[PDB]
Amino acid sequence: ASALPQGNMKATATSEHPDVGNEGLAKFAIDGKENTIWHTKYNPVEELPQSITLELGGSYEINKFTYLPRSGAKNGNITKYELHVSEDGNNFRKISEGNWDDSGSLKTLKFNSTKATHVKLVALEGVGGFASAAELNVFA
Ligand SMILES: [Ca+2]
Ligand code: NA
């Protein structure tokens, strides 16, 4: 499986902090820059759950998803998640769920090959009551 080029993707989120330098637009989750993050809105706080959706630029049989947390600081490190896919951009189905430790470690989801044009990462819980992501990648 190979990471799909992020430049063919479009990221949208249910909440994003505006650009205050290196956070927190959704698009910052797929820019190839480890120092830039998506972060949920927090002037003032928009409470979880919140999600980020990646439009993949095509139809792919995907089988792996990686979540790279922000480096150093911990706010928004996602600790309870669901991963959903859509073949159409409209209807989403849950394909993975669980808990993640709050470290900055890469979190990797491996699942049975599934057709998707979109992937959605739902943050149910995250450090500080926020969600953030330095880099999201999707593999086919
Ligand atoms: Ca980034
Ligand atoms: Na779409």
Q: What totals of helices (H) and strands (E) does the chain contain, helices first?
A: 0, 9
Ligand that comes closest to the CA of residue 87: 2
Burial string for 49-80 (b: 16+ CB within 10 Å, else e) reads bbbbbbebeeebebebbebbbbeeebbbbbbe
Ligand 2 ion: Cβ-proximal residues, 5 Å cutoff: 55, 89
> In whole angstroms, what is the distance from residue 26 CA to residue 41 CA?
10
Total domains, the chain: 1
Rounded to the nearest 5 degrees, what angle is found at the Cα of 78, between the Cα atoms of 18 and 137? 75
Order of all β-strands in the sheet with 23-24: 23-24, 37-39, 132-133
Residue 104 · residue 72 · CB < 8 Å: yes
> In whole angstroms, what is the distance from residue 78 CA to residue 81 CA?
7
DSSP 8: G
CATH code, domain with 131: 2.60.120.260
What would the 3-class secondary structure string for 75-101 be?
Answer: CCCEEEEEEEEECCCCCCEEEEEEECC
Ligand 1 ion: Cβ-proximal residues, 5 Å cutoff: 28, 31, 33, 36, 134-135
> In whole angstroms, what is the distance from residue 51 CA to residue 63 CA?
20
Tell me how far CA of residue 19 lies from CA of 23, 27, 35, in angstroms: 6, 10, 13
Ligand that comes closest to the CA of residue 88: 2
Residue 84 · residue 120 · CB < 8 Å: yes
Residue 92 · residue 86 · CB < 8 Å: yes
Q: Considering only CA atoms, which of 115, 37, 111 is closest in space to residue 76? A: 37
Q: How much distance in Å is there from the Cα of 136 to the middle of ligand 1?
A: 8
Residue 98 · residue 79 · CB < 8 Å: no
What's this structure's resolution in Å? 1.7
Domain that holds residue 70: 1-140
Q: How many CB atoms lie within 10 A of CB 119?
A: 25
Q: Considering only CA atoms, which of 78, 92, 90, 70 is closest in space to residue 50? A: 78
Ligand that comes closest to the CA of residue 29: 1
Q: Considering only CA atoms, which of 106, 140, 133, 96 is closest in space to residue 22? A: 133
